[PDB]
Amino acid sequence: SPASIPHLILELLKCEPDEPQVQAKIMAYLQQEQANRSKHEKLSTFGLMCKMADQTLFSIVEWARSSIFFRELKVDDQMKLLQNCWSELLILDHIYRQVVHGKEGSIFLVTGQQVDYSIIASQAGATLNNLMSHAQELVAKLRSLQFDQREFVCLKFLVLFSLDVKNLENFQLVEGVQEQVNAALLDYTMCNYPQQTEKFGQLLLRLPEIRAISMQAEEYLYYKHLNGDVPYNNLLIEMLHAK
Amino acid sequence: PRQGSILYSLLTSSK
Ligand SMILES: CCCCCCCCCCCCCCCC(=O)OC[C@@H](COP(=O)(O)O[C@H]1[C@H](O)[C@@H](OP(=O)(O)O)[C@H](OP(=O)(O)O)[C@@H](OP(=O)(O)O)[C@H]1O)OC(=O)CCCCCCCCCCCCCCC
Numbered sequence: 001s002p003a004s005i006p007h008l009i010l011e012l013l014k015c016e017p018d019e020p021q022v023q024a025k026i027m028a029y030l031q032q033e034q035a036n037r038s039k040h041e042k043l044s045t046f047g048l049m050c051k052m053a054d055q056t057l058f059s060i061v062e063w064a065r066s067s068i069f070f071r072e073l074k075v076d077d078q079m080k081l082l083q084n085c086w087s088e089l090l091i092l093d094h095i096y097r098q099v100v101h102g103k104e105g106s107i108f109l110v111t112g113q114q115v116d117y118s119i120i121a122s123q124a125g126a127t128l129n130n131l132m133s134h135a136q137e138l139v140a141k142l143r144s145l146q147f148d149q150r151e152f153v154c155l156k157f158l159v160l161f162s163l164d165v166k167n168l169e170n171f172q173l174v175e176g177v178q179e180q181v182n183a184a185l186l187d188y189t190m191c192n193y194p195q196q197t198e199k200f201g202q203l204l205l206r207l208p209e210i211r212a213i214s215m216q217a218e219e220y221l222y223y224k225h226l227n228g229d230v231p232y233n234n235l236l237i238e239m240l241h242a243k
Numbered sequence: 244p245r246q247g248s249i250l251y252s253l254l255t256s257s258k
Pocket of ligand 1: 094107115123125214217220221
């Protein structure tokens with residue numbers, strides 16, 4: 001942590017989840033699910049990766065519900081904000097994980113497991129390959145910018161407290177959060193990365209790329225689901241079909 | 244009404 005972090009960002013950071021704990025819990029659920037299945041009821045790699053993404057989304061919702069500002073909204077408003085941004089938060093989570101824990105050529109998973117990009121290149125279809133090609137480049141850009149945890153938590157709030165959401169009772173609090181977080185991120189980047197005179201603007205430019213990736217991920221999930229490749233009802237699927 | 248809502252369940256548990 002740098003010597004200089006804005007008070008608002010300090011408060012956002014307090015709300016962060018305990019990474020080592022999230023990783024363990026997820027790795028356990030996953031194992032038990034695959035055990036005690038006959039040959040023709042055993043889960044595919046896709047089914048396991050789906051349950052993994054589902055449990056990560058549970059963790060994201062658990063983060064949001066106890067978070068500063070978000071916790072001040074009524075449940076109905078909370079539902080609307082999360083339905084608007086769920087896939088973007090999953091994508092942002094994945095991308096930041098690659099920046100912190102990942103290395104060139106390999107994808108680091110929430111369980112601490114890893115798979116090489118080259119495996120996907122060979123084996124996967126066109127939708128997942130395009131998806132992964134764009135995510136890999138976004139990670140590469142963020143590594144170049146020296147994207148850090150302070151900036152990461154600011155982006156999470158900017159994605160969550162979106163101005164594009166209609167029918168909120170307390171739309172005012174949402175505007176307030178967006179204004180305050182934008183201002184703190186700009187102060188933070190100018191202070192701590194002064195050689196990068198454009199870092200704030202460059203970080204904001206990544207948000208439309210995050211949105212584009214999460215939409216193609218939704219499309220990918222949708223087709224897999226309607227092909228029968230999704231094991232049971234889960235939060236992922238609920239969010240996919242909502243609104 | 245979608246009583247089956249997992250998201251609603253998670254949110255109502257914190258309010
Ligand atoms: C959501 C948070 C972000 C977290 C993402 C991190 C997880 C990613 C790491 C997992 C990689 C591990 C497995 C790598 C091995 C893998 O690549 O090989 C298996 C391949 C099989 O390849 P595809 O899944 O692409 O299936 C292809 C494909 O559907 C072809 O259609 P398209 O070319 O149009 O896309 C299809 O061709 P046809 O339409 O012509 O029939 C093809 O059918 P066929 O075979 O009959 O020709 C079909 O197979 O991969 C699978 O096992 C699943 C890949 C693992 C799952 C990756 C991510 C799953 C996360 C949960 C779902 C995403 C939800 C996103 C929410 C935002």
